Structure formats: C-alpha cells, structure tokens
Amino acid sequence: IRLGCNVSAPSGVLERVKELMEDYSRAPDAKFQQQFRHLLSVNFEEFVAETKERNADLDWVNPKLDERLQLELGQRQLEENAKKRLEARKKLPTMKYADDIIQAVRENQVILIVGSTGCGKTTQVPQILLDDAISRGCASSCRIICTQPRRISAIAIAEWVSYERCESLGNSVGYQIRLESRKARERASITYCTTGVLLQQLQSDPLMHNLSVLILDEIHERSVETDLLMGLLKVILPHRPDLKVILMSATVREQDFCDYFNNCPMFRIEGVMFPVKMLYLEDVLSKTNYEFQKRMKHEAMIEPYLRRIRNSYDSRVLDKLRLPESEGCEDIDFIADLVYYICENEPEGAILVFLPGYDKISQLYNILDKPKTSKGQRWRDHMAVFPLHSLMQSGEQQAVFRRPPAGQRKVIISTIIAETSVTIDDVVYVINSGRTKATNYDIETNIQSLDEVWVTKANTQQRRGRAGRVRPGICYNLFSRAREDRMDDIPTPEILRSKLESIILSLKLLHIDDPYRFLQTLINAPNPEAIKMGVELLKRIEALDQTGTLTPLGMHLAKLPIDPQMGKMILMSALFCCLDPITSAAAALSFKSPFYSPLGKESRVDEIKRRMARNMRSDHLMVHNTIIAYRDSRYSHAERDFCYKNFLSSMTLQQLERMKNQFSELLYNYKFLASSNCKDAASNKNSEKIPLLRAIIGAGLYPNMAHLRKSRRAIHTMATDDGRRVNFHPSSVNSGESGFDSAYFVYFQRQKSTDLFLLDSTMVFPMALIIFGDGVEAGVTQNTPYLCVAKTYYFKCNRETADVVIQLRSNLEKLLLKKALYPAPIEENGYEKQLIKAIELLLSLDERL
DNA sequence: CTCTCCCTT
C-alpha cells in the first residue's frame, strides 16, 4: 500500500462544514413519487391493460374526413400534376407489386419486403399502403411510421415522398428526428423518423397504440436500435392483434428476418441500377501490370486458388497474387497506379477509393497531390482530389458532391463513411481496398481496441453499388477472389459490441424487468457476461438497488436521451448549479467533438485546442470554452470567420447547443430546474468555479481514473485505476503537457491502438473524487492516518477531516435519494442548499492560487 | 504523437 498527497482540511473550514451539515441536519407535492411507486407495483398483465386505456386515440375515426380524402384523392387523379407522377411512379419495380403487398398486409400481421437500391420500397410502400386506405374510405384510421437508421435519410426521403404527392412538407408526409420535426397531419399520414425516435416514444406508448402500420427500414444493417425494436415486437404484437408491420431489408442475410418472425411472407423486389462490373486482384494486375517492391497463413489461402485459374491469367499475374502485400492497401503506390490507369483509359466519371483510416487516406493524398513518379506529375493537375472523413470538413461543403471543372476528374479518398451515410452521385469507378478499421471489445481484459480488418461480403456488395448511380461503372477489388471466400457474411451485429447499461435500464420503463430473459430472444443474443457487467454498473451508480430493481434516480436516467453516467452528471449540475458547463461536457461525449482535423493542419489544430482549453487541462471543459466562444461569434456576426480560424464545424456546434437546450428542458420538466434555459443565471451561479466543474465531471465519469507519475512535449507514465499503462491520446489537449495541478484524471473512453490511449480527459482533485465516489474508508496504514477512494488511491489525511468528509458523504447520499423521489430545485436560501455550500467550500480549497 | 461509423417523445 502506497501513500499519496495530504487532503486534510484547515480547522476554520472543517468548523464551518460542521456548521452547515448540521443546518441541513435540522430540516423537516410529488406526483413523481406516486408514478415511480406505481411502475414497480404493477405486474405485466396490468401494465398492458392500463396503457391500452391511456392511448385510446385511434379507436375514433372521422368519416367526414374519410369521405373528404377519398373524394380529394379520386379528384386530384384527373388533374394534370399527378398522372405523370402516377405514371412515372409505375416505372419503379415496387409498383408492379402494389396489389400483392396490400393483400399480404391484410392477410398477415408481419411481412418482409426484400429489395435492393432503387426498387422504391422506401418511397413507394408507404404511399401504396396509405392510398389503399384513403380509397377504401378508411383514411382517418391510417397512420404510418417508417423508421430509418440515419437522420439524413429520414429527412431526404420525407422531402422526396412529399414532392411526389404534390404537397409541402408537413401535410401527409412528415419527418421526425431528435430535436427537429416537420410533423405530418394527425391522421392519414406518413412520418419518417429515426429508429431512436420511436424507441423513446415507446415510454409513453409501449404497445404502439398510436400507429396503424410500422415499417422498419434497413433492418439488414443490424443497427442496435432495429434489433432491439424487432425483439420488442415479439413481446408487443401478441397484444396488438390489429397492428401491421412491414419489415424492409436489402438482400443481405434476408432469410434471418424471415426466420426470426415465424416463417412470415417474403417479397423480393428486383432492383434498378446501372450494372457495375466486378474486378478482383487478378483482374487488376492483368490490366495495369503493376510491379511490387520498396505470416503465411497467406500462402495457405492463395495457393489453392492459383491452381483452379492457372490458365485464365498470365503466370506473372498469378505470381504477383502470392505476395502478402498485393491485397488490401499495403502498397499505396499500387492504388495510385490504378487511379492513374483509370484516368488514362476509361470514360469520364469520378473515382471512389475506399481506404481503412486517416493515416492511409493521408498517404494516398500526398502521393496524388505531390507525386514523385513521372506518371503522377503528369496527372496531378488533372485530378480534383477530396479526402472524405468524418473528422474532415469535406463532407460539410458542396464541393465533393458537385462535378469537377472541365478537363479534371474527381477523385475521392474515403473511409467507410461514403458506403452509406454520404452519397456521391457522379462516381462511376470504385476502388475497394477491402480493409477498414473496427472497434473490438475484449470482455476479459476490458480493453476496447480499434484494429484494421478485412471488410465483409456485405461491405463489398454495398461499395459496388456506389458506382452504379449514374452510368455503368466499375468496382475494382484489391483482394483476390480467394480472399472474399474467407470474408464474413456481414459485420458483427451492432448489439454484440455495445455497452448494455443504457438498454438494460430503458427496458425497465417498458416493464421488461429481467434483461437476461428478453435480450436473449433477439436475432443475436448478446454475451450474458456483458449484461451482468452492465447491470453491475447500474448498481454501482445507484440507478438499480442490490436486488436489481429500478431506483428513483434510475427511473430518471432511463427517461433521458443520454447514457446513464452522464445523465447523472447532468442531474448533479442541476443541484450544484453548474448546468451550462456540464451539459456541454455531457453532450460532447454523447455526440462528438466540434473540431475538424483537416489534412496537414494537425499540429495547428492541437494549438487551437490548447488555446481553447485555456490551460484548464480538461478536454470536456475545452469543448465548453469553444461553445462560449461560438455564442459570442454569433453575437459578433463573425460566425464563419470564427469557425474557419479554429477549424470548427458550425453544423456540429449547433447540434451540441440543441442537445444542451434539450437537457435543460427535460430537467425543467422533471422539476430539477427553475428555468428551461441552460444559460439561466440562477441555474449557473457556480458555473465559474473550476474545482466544482471538475467535481461533477468526476461524479459523472467515475470510476474511470488515471494516475500520472512522470516528467520531461514531455514523457508520461500514467496508469489507469486497474494498473494498465495508458497515455493521453494525441488529440487530447493533455498529450505532452507538463506541470499539472493534479496527477489524477477522469476519462470517458479508453482505447488501444498503437498504445493504450485515453481519448479525452479531465484533471480532478483528490478531495472531489472522495466526496462523490465510493469505496471511501479511513484508517492507518503504517503510522500514517489515511483516506482512500475505491480501495485503490489511499491519501494521507488527518482524523478531524476524515470524520467530517465521511459524515459529509452520508448527508450527500441522503439528499440525492430524497431529490430523486421528490423532485424540486434546491432552494437558494433553504436547508438543502446548506449542504451544497458545504461541498462548494471544501472543493474550493484546491483552487489555483 | 493519432483519429471506423450510426444515434436517442
């Protein structure tokens, strides 16, 4: 047992703390207490019966409305706006199947529609279903909710389906995503919404009484949300006999869903695309004759294949396929030669080059942009080159989507981002390296890693379509066909890699009280060790009690659209009055950093972050300083100038602000705040006291802790609370710094790539951890009196302080348990505020003098 | 000294 620094407190401070705690100790309507008591008291049969009654709206139809839309439908079909658009709609493959789909819905509870891009299922199947019910005179009874994996798709589709109906957005077609909507009309409407939007609406409507038809789109992606939603539908539909569900899927393991729901009917709808030719490694080396120089394993895979084809390819073609570096991206110059080949031969079209990561995209850009070979110096001015990456600005400007100036060919070097989320239409040529980067979690060592891996068969098929948008294209695969045979069908289903705390808690609101029972009934059941490791977290942070049942704090956390640890952080900041700095910290972790990392500017960006941190040694606070600067830049009308100098995305910043505004309004609604404004000065009085901000950021990220012992940029020896060596990720403001006020850090996400990295970090002080943490006990180790936290970091402390801090932690826990059952803002002058001031006092003693 | 990608009445 090794001892750390002295946390003991002055007598005048300790004397005052005791004066306050004992003021609080002298203290003596809640609808929430009853609601929480009721959710625990009801069994599942009763939970069902009640939610039927409260969502009764759809048992009521408006025949005068029915008659009116049946009549305005038949009438506007003789007009000249529709009847081309009805006749151009009939050009879609789906429209041939209109009639057979309706009959399948009438005759079956769940059906499955399997179709590839362009078959029109997403745009047409909702219109198909709705227009039958308008014509049969049912129009008011019909409400269709169609879930999408991505926000962009939810809007675009809603605007497209809307232009096709000769309406503005917001009449019969509407979209709903997080913090934005054009809602369609109450009845006779199609709403496109993200899968997450629907799961939250289930808390008020767990059995879906508020829709006639559900359409899950892009279930083949195995998004976490879709797999849970299908799993819930096994529990829902038995009590929803009149409900009609349309599952919708690409042609990727389509049978899994057909199997999952009984043997339910399946429709396969033929695609619309331009044909794209597939070439593989042998086909590439045959055209360009590119030559290589600067385990096996690999020999065992390729040698069987070389024999079967030996007379289809030149012996110097087959001979090159023996090299481990011919497949994937290992030789970048090779991929450079192919782009150079496609520019010399071949028709005009854009080139899409899929490469695994940032590092590799930079490699090819620098080969293309400042080329050393003679062939490249020829082409350099004739290529218009965009890197495309989620941390790079390119996707947020119009440049990469528009076609290049005459006499130039547009060449994108991209990650997996251009596979779905971002779509470039003039791409006729796709170079698929077959390599990407993936996160993997190892339950045994509790290390998440990001490794370079081969893509799967489904990845390859989907990357091919991205060239078939405009004209017949080509897909160039840089791995052999024999390699494709060792590739998986699909990537690992998302639920199998993800932290389970947030779900397990959410299911409780739906009266699913045993997560091991439910989550096992999914298409893929998670590892049950991961559920446990998850329920064990929800017990630690006191959302579930030791028996595993929801606590009053737990019912709140499951009601907030953020992971359980930070929803609590946000609650702490309501009571401790740091709301604006904290909800910035929270929303940045839930979503993402505002900073771009454009190519070549890396050192310049670390400078902007270091200056934005204001030497606060906090990445989380660093983002908040950025938002404070952003809000002034909107006040100074300087906004664009601002985001350019600091490499910031104003699209992302507006979202963080929108999230923060949400957290405010939920807290104000839950009776934890007096104003729904996260800038309200009443709610922020403590928002400047940096030791307090670190104290809540600690209360939020605990138990993720790190310990720094070294010196020198500088060299760091730091270990996490488990003993494994870690370093600040090079993008964290804290990499390479020296001179920290404290050697202890809290972190959100730990990750191994080339080293064990902490991705973002906040320096905290021992006294703060010990208050808000757990595993606090006092004793004597040698002859030294100590105070520790988590039975790991033991600090020197004298006894008058231990007895007071330990008495302080009791009165804090008592307060929290009460504020959760009986929500109310802490009165500024009341008894509860007294305990707050006691903690503000103690934490303030760490201030930088 | 480095960064695959979605997303939550």
Short mmCIF file of N, CA and C in Angstrom, two decimals, chain A residues 387-482:
data_model
loop_
_atom_site.label_atom_id
_atom_site.label_comp_id
_atom_site.label_asym_id
_atom_site.label_seq_id
_atom_site.Cartn_x
_atom_site.Cartn_y
_atom_site.Cartn_z
N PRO A 387 -10.19 14.34 -49.92
CA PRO A 387 -10.30 13.33 -48.88
C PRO A 387 -11.67 13.45 -48.24
N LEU A 388 -12.24 12.32 -47.83
CA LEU A 388 -13.57 12.30 -47.20
C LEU A 388 -13.48 11.49 -45.91
N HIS A 389 -13.69 12.14 -44.76
CA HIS A 389 -13.54 11.51 -43.45
C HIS A 389 -14.44 12.25 -42.47
N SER A 390 -14.97 11.53 -41.46
CA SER A 390 -15.92 12.15 -40.52
C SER A 390 -15.30 13.27 -39.70
N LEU A 391 -13.98 13.31 -39.57
CA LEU A 391 -13.31 14.41 -38.89
C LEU A 391 -12.86 15.51 -39.85
N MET A 392 -13.05 15.35 -41.16
CA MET A 392 -12.63 16.34 -42.14
C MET A 392 -13.83 17.10 -42.65
N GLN A 393 -13.59 18.37 -43.02
CA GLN A 393 -14.68 19.26 -43.39
C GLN A 393 -15.36 18.89 -44.71
N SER A 394 -14.67 18.16 -45.60
CA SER A 394 -15.11 17.99 -46.99
C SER A 394 -16.59 17.64 -47.10
N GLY A 395 -17.06 16.69 -46.29
CA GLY A 395 -18.45 16.29 -46.35
C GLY A 395 -19.46 17.38 -46.01
N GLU A 396 -19.02 18.45 -45.35
CA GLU A 396 -19.93 19.52 -44.94
C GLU A 396 -19.92 20.72 -45.88
N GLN A 397 -19.18 20.65 -46.98
CA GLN A 397 -19.25 21.61 -48.08
C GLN A 397 -19.85 20.92 -49.31
N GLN A 398 -20.11 21.71 -50.35
CA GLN A 398 -20.79 21.21 -51.54
C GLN A 398 -19.81 20.69 -52.58
N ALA A 399 -18.51 20.89 -52.34
CA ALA A 399 -17.51 20.75 -53.40
C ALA A 399 -17.44 19.32 -53.90
N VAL A 400 -17.37 18.36 -52.97
CA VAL A 400 -17.15 16.98 -53.34
C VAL A 400 -18.39 16.40 -54.00
N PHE A 401 -19.56 16.98 -53.77
CA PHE A 401 -20.74 16.45 -54.44
C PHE A 401 -20.91 16.96 -55.87
N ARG A 402 -20.47 18.18 -56.16
CA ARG A 402 -20.64 18.75 -57.49
C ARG A 402 -19.58 18.18 -58.44
N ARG A 403 -19.90 18.14 -59.74
CA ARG A 403 -18.99 17.58 -60.75
C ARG A 403 -17.81 18.50 -61.03
N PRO A 404 -16.65 17.93 -61.37
CA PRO A 404 -15.40 18.72 -61.43
C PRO A 404 -15.37 19.66 -62.63
N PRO A 405 -14.50 20.68 -62.59
CA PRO A 405 -14.31 21.56 -63.74
C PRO A 405 -13.88 20.75 -64.96
N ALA A 406 -14.19 21.28 -66.14
CA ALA A 406 -13.89 20.57 -67.38
C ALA A 406 -12.40 20.25 -67.47
N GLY A 407 -12.09 19.05 -67.98
CA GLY A 407 -10.72 18.58 -68.09
C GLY A 407 -10.08 18.08 -66.81
N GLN A 408 -10.83 17.98 -65.71
CA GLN A 408 -10.41 17.37 -64.46
C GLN A 408 -11.28 16.16 -64.13
N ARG A 409 -10.72 15.17 -63.44
CA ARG A 409 -11.50 14.03 -62.99
C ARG A 409 -11.56 14.01 -61.46
N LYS A 410 -12.77 13.92 -60.89
CA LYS A 410 -12.94 13.99 -59.44
C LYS A 410 -12.54 12.67 -58.77
N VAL A 411 -11.58 12.73 -57.84
CA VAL A 411 -11.07 11.54 -57.14
C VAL A 411 -11.28 11.70 -55.64
N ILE A 412 -12.13 10.87 -55.05
CA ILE A 412 -12.35 10.90 -53.61
C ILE A 412 -11.57 9.76 -52.97
N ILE A 413 -10.86 10.08 -51.89
CA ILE A 413 -10.24 9.10 -50.99
C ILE A 413 -10.98 9.16 -49.66
N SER A 414 -11.65 8.05 -49.34
CA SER A 414 -12.69 7.99 -48.33
C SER A 414 -12.48 6.79 -47.41
N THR A 415 -13.10 6.91 -46.24
CA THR A 415 -13.30 5.80 -45.32
C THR A 415 -14.64 5.15 -45.61
N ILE A 416 -15.08 4.27 -44.70
CA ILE A 416 -16.38 3.63 -44.82
C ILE A 416 -17.52 4.63 -44.84
N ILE A 417 -17.23 5.90 -44.56
CA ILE A 417 -18.27 6.92 -44.49
C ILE A 417 -19.06 7.04 -45.80
N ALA A 418 -18.40 6.84 -46.94
CA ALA A 418 -19.06 7.01 -48.23
C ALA A 418 -19.82 5.76 -48.67
N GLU A 419 -19.84 4.73 -47.82
CA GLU A 419 -20.51 3.46 -48.11
C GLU A 419 -22.02 3.60 -47.99
N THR A 420 -22.50 4.34 -46.98
CA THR A 420 -23.91 4.68 -46.82
C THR A 420 -24.18 6.16 -46.52
N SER A 421 -23.68 6.64 -45.37
CA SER A 421 -24.10 7.94 -44.83
C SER A 421 -23.93 9.10 -45.81
N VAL A 422 -22.91 9.04 -46.66
CA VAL A 422 -22.61 10.11 -47.60
C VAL A 422 -22.63 9.49 -48.99
N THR A 423 -23.32 10.15 -49.93
CA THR A 423 -23.58 9.60 -51.26
C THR A 423 -23.11 10.59 -52.31
N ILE A 424 -22.18 10.17 -53.16
CA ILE A 424 -21.69 10.99 -54.26
C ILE A 424 -22.14 10.34 -55.55
N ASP A 425 -22.91 11.10 -56.34
CA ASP A 425 -23.65 10.55 -57.48
C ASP A 425 -22.83 10.41 -58.77
N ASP A 426 -21.78 11.20 -58.98
CA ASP A 426 -21.04 11.10 -60.24
C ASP A 426 -19.93 10.05 -60.18
N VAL A 427 -19.88 9.26 -59.11
CA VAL A 427 -18.89 8.20 -59.03
C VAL A 427 -19.32 7.11 -60.01
N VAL A 428 -18.49 6.86 -61.02
CA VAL A 428 -18.64 5.70 -61.89
C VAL A 428 -17.62 4.58 -61.60
N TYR A 429 -16.58 4.84 -60.79
CA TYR A 429 -15.48 3.89 -60.58
C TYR A 429 -15.19 3.79 -59.09
N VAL A 430 -15.15 2.56 -58.57
CA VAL A 430 -14.91 2.32 -57.14
C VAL A 430 -13.70 1.40 -56.99
N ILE A 431 -12.70 1.85 -56.24
CA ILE A 431 -11.56 1.01 -55.87
C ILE A 431 -11.77 0.57 -54.44
N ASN A 432 -12.02 -0.71 -54.22
CA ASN A 432 -12.33 -1.20 -52.88
C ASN A 432 -11.11 -1.93 -52.33
N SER A 433 -10.40 -1.30 -51.39
CA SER A 433 -9.24 -1.94 -50.78
C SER A 433 -9.61 -3.19 -50.01
N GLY A 434 -10.85 -3.31 -49.57
CA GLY A 434 -11.24 -4.44 -48.74
C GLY A 434 -10.86 -4.34 -47.27
N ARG A 435 -10.21 -3.25 -46.85
CA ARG A 435 -9.76 -3.01 -45.48
C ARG A 435 -10.51 -1.81 -44.89
N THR A 436 -10.89 -1.92 -43.61
CA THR A 436 -11.46 -0.82 -42.83
C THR A 436 -10.85 -0.89 -41.43
N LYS A 437 -11.31 -0.02 -40.52
CA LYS A 437 -10.95 -0.09 -39.11
C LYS A 437 -12.19 -0.41 -38.29
N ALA A 438 -12.02 -1.20 -37.24
CA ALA A 438 -13.13 -1.65 -36.43
C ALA A 438 -12.78 -1.62 -34.96
N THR A 439 -13.77 -1.32 -34.14
CA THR A 439 -13.63 -1.43 -32.71
C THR A 439 -14.01 -2.83 -32.29
N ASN A 440 -13.21 -3.38 -31.38
CA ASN A 440 -13.48 -4.68 -30.80
C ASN A 440 -13.33 -4.53 -29.31
N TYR A 441 -14.20 -5.18 -28.56
CA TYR A 441 -14.13 -5.16 -27.12
C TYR A 441 -13.78 -6.56 -26.65
N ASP A 442 -12.82 -6.63 -25.73
CA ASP A 442 -12.40 -7.86 -25.07
C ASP A 442 -12.90 -7.84 -23.63
N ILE A 443 -13.89 -8.69 -23.33
CA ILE A 443 -14.55 -8.65 -22.03
C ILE A 443 -13.56 -9.04 -20.93
N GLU A 444 -12.56 -9.86 -21.27
CA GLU A 444 -11.64 -10.40 -20.27
C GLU A 444 -10.67 -9.34 -19.77
N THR A 445 -10.09 -8.56 -20.68
CA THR A 445 -9.14 -7.53 -20.29
C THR A 445 -9.77 -6.13 -20.20
N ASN A 446 -11.06 -6.00 -20.52
CA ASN A 446 -11.76 -4.71 -20.52
C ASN A 446 -10.96 -3.66 -21.29
N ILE A 447 -10.50 -4.03 -22.47
CA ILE A 447 -9.83 -3.11 -23.38
C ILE A 447 -10.64 -3.07 -24.67
N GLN A 448 -11.10 -1.88 -25.05
CA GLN A 448 -11.64 -1.67 -26.38
C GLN A 448 -10.48 -1.28 -27.29
N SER A 449 -10.47 -1.84 -28.49
CA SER A 449 -9.41 -1.55 -29.45
C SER A 449 -10.04 -1.19 -30.79
N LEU A 450 -9.23 -0.52 -31.61
CA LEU A 450 -9.58 -0.16 -32.98
C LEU A 450 -8.49 -0.79 -33.83
N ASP A 451 -8.86 -1.77 -34.65
CA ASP A 451 -7.89 -2.51 -35.43
C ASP A 451 -8.28 -2.43 -36.90
N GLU A 452 -7.27 -2.52 -37.77
CA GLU A 452 -7.50 -2.68 -39.20
C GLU A 452 -7.97 -4.10 -39.49
N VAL A 453 -9.08 -4.24 -40.20
CA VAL A 453 -9.65 -5.56 -40.50
C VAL A 453 -10.08 -5.62 -41.97
N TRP A 454 -10.33 -6.84 -42.45
CA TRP A 454 -10.90 -7.00 -43.78
C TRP A 454 -12.39 -6.68 -43.73
N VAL A 455 -12.92 -6.14 -44.83
CA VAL A 455 -14.36 -5.91 -44.89
C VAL A 455 -15.05 -7.25 -45.02
N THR A 456 -16.38 -7.25 -45.03
CA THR A 456 -17.16 -8.47 -45.15
C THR A 456 -17.76 -8.57 -46.56
N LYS A 457 -18.42 -9.70 -46.85
CA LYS A 457 -19.03 -9.83 -48.16
C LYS A 457 -20.09 -8.76 -48.39
N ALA A 458 -20.83 -8.40 -47.34
CA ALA A 458 -21.87 -7.38 -47.47
C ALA A 458 -21.27 -6.00 -47.68
N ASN A 459 -20.13 -5.73 -47.06
CA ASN A 459 -19.45 -4.46 -47.31
C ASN A 459 -19.10 -4.32 -48.78
N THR A 460 -18.51 -5.39 -49.35
CA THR A 460 -18.05 -5.39 -50.74
C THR A 460 -19.22 -5.16 -51.71
N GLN A 461 -20.33 -5.86 -51.51
CA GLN A 461 -21.52 -5.70 -52.33
C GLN A 461 -22.04 -4.26 -52.30
N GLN A 462 -22.10 -3.65 -51.10
CA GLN A 462 -22.59 -2.28 -50.92
C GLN A 462 -21.65 -1.22 -51.50
N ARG A 463 -20.34 -1.44 -51.41
CA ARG A 463 -19.40 -0.50 -52.01
C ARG A 463 -19.50 -0.51 -53.54
N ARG A 464 -19.90 -1.64 -54.11
CA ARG A 464 -20.08 -1.76 -55.56
C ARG A 464 -21.23 -0.87 -56.05
N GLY A 465 -22.34 -0.84 -55.32
CA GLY A 465 -23.46 0.00 -55.72
C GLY A 465 -23.14 1.48 -55.83
N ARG A 466 -22.12 1.96 -55.11
CA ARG A 466 -21.89 3.40 -55.09
C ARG A 466 -21.37 3.95 -56.41
N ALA A 467 -20.94 3.08 -57.33
CA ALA A 467 -20.55 3.45 -58.70
C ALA A 467 -21.67 3.31 -59.72
N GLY A 468 -22.79 2.70 -59.34
CA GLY A 468 -23.87 2.38 -60.25
C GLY A 468 -24.97 3.40 -60.17
N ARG A 469 -24.60 4.62 -59.77
CA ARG A 469 -25.61 5.65 -59.60
C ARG A 469 -25.99 6.31 -60.93
N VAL A 470 -25.02 6.67 -61.76
CA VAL A 470 -25.27 7.46 -62.97
C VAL A 470 -25.19 6.61 -64.23
N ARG A 471 -24.04 6.02 -64.52
CA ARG A 471 -23.83 5.23 -65.71
C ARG A 471 -23.18 3.92 -65.32
N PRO A 472 -23.14 2.96 -66.23
CA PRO A 472 -22.47 1.70 -65.92
C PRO A 472 -21.03 1.93 -65.51
N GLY A 473 -20.69 1.43 -64.32
CA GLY A 473 -19.41 1.67 -63.70
C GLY A 473 -18.54 0.44 -63.57
N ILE A 474 -17.47 0.61 -62.80
CA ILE A 474 -16.56 -0.48 -62.47
C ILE A 474 -16.22 -0.45 -60.97
N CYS A 475 -16.19 -1.63 -60.36
CA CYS A 475 -15.74 -1.85 -58.99
C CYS A 475 -14.42 -2.63 -58.98
N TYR A 476 -13.33 -1.99 -58.57
CA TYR A 476 -12.02 -2.64 -58.53
C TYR A 476 -11.67 -3.10 -57.11
N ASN A 477 -11.73 -4.42 -56.89
CA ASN A 477 -11.36 -5.03 -55.61
C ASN A 477 -9.89 -5.41 -55.58
N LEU A 478 -9.18 -4.89 -54.59
CA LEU A 478 -7.75 -5.06 -54.41
C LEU A 478 -7.41 -6.29 -53.58
N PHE A 479 -8.35 -7.22 -53.40
CA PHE A 479 -8.07 -8.51 -52.80
C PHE A 479 -8.45 -9.61 -53.80
N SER A 480 -7.86 -10.78 -53.63
CA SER A 480 -8.17 -11.86 -54.54
C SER A 480 -9.59 -12.36 -54.30
N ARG A 481 -10.13 -13.08 -55.28
CA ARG A 481 -11.41 -13.77 -55.07
C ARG A 481 -11.30 -14.82 -53.97
N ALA A 482 -10.12 -15.43 -53.80
CA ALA A 482 -9.99 -16.43 -52.75
C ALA A 482 -10.13 -15.81 -51.38
#
